[PDB]
Amino acid sequence: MDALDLLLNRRSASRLAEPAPAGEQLENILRAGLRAPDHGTLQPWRFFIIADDGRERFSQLLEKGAREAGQDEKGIEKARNAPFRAPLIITVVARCEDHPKVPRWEQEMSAGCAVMAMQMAALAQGFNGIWRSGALTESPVVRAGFECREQDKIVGFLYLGTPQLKASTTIALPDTAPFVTRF
């Protein structure tokens, strides 16, 4: 795949199935995330790989978080079923530290950029994924499951796999006119 083409046509996929990226292709995804821009080279990220019986453990963690948040039956059921929408999930935590010259939001932003880079690396190899978050990124139960300290943040659950639909190449490039001004 061409680099400019990937960037111009970057699309996510929510319908995902086996096979998951694995072995060297998963390692390529992880290294792409570690190349996220990073003010001060703080490497403010932790990555959790969720696969196989990890998905069942993730289901139990999310259900407990949904119950603890007071969600209704439908929300608890959605949390229970969430991990089985893809064969692999990578949870990205912004691991933040007190650096007076590097604001917290910049460290979080670097972790978020890692998510996007990993989705792009998936796409570049014939896989795809979708960056998901929702209210349970803020659940104490869920954050404790991902070893969050008080200043850390879950910035995404990146669902990964083989997309059921090939990424469309039949769609026009975005229009810049409403978003761009000359300063």
Residues 6+ apart with CB under 8 A from 67: 76
Q: Closest separation between CB of residue 39 and ligand FMN, Å?
A: 3
CA 42, CA 123: separation in Å to the nearest integer?
Answer: 27
Segment near ligand FMN (CB under 6 A), from 72-80, 86-94, 104-112, 143-151? 104-112
Decide whether 53 or 100 has the Cβ nearer to ligand FMN: 100
Contact 102, 169 (CB under 8 A): no
Q: Closest separation between CB of residue 64 and ligand FMN, Å?
A: 19
Decide whether 1 or 17 has the Cβ nearer to its own copies: 1
CA 39 to the chain's CA centroid = 20
Q: Is 109 in the site for ligand FMN (CB under 6 A)?
A: yes
CA 181, CA 19: separation in Å to the nearest integer?
Answer: 44
Residue 131 has φ and ψ, to the nearest 5°, of -75, 115
Helix (H, G, I), strand (E, B) or coil at 102: coil
Q: Is 14 annotated as a binding residue?
A: no
Q: Is 157 in the site for its own copies (CB under 8 A)?
A: no
Find which of its own copies, ligand FMN, none residue 124 binds, CB within 5 to 8 Å per kind.
its own copies
Of 80, 106, 125, 141, the one binding ligand FMN (CB under 6 A) is 106
Of 3, 70, 72, 73, the one binding its own copies (CB under 8 A) is 3
Helix (H, G, I), strand (E, B) or coil at 100: coil
CA 88, CA 178: separation in Å to the nearest integer?
Answer: 37
Contact 102, 40 (CB under 8 A): yes
Of 130, 136, 148, 154, the one binding ligand FMN (CB under 6 A) is 130
Find which of its own copies, ligand FMN, none residue 49 binds, CB within 5 to 8 Å per kind.
its own copies
Q: Is 82 in the site for its own copies (CB under 8 A)?
A: no
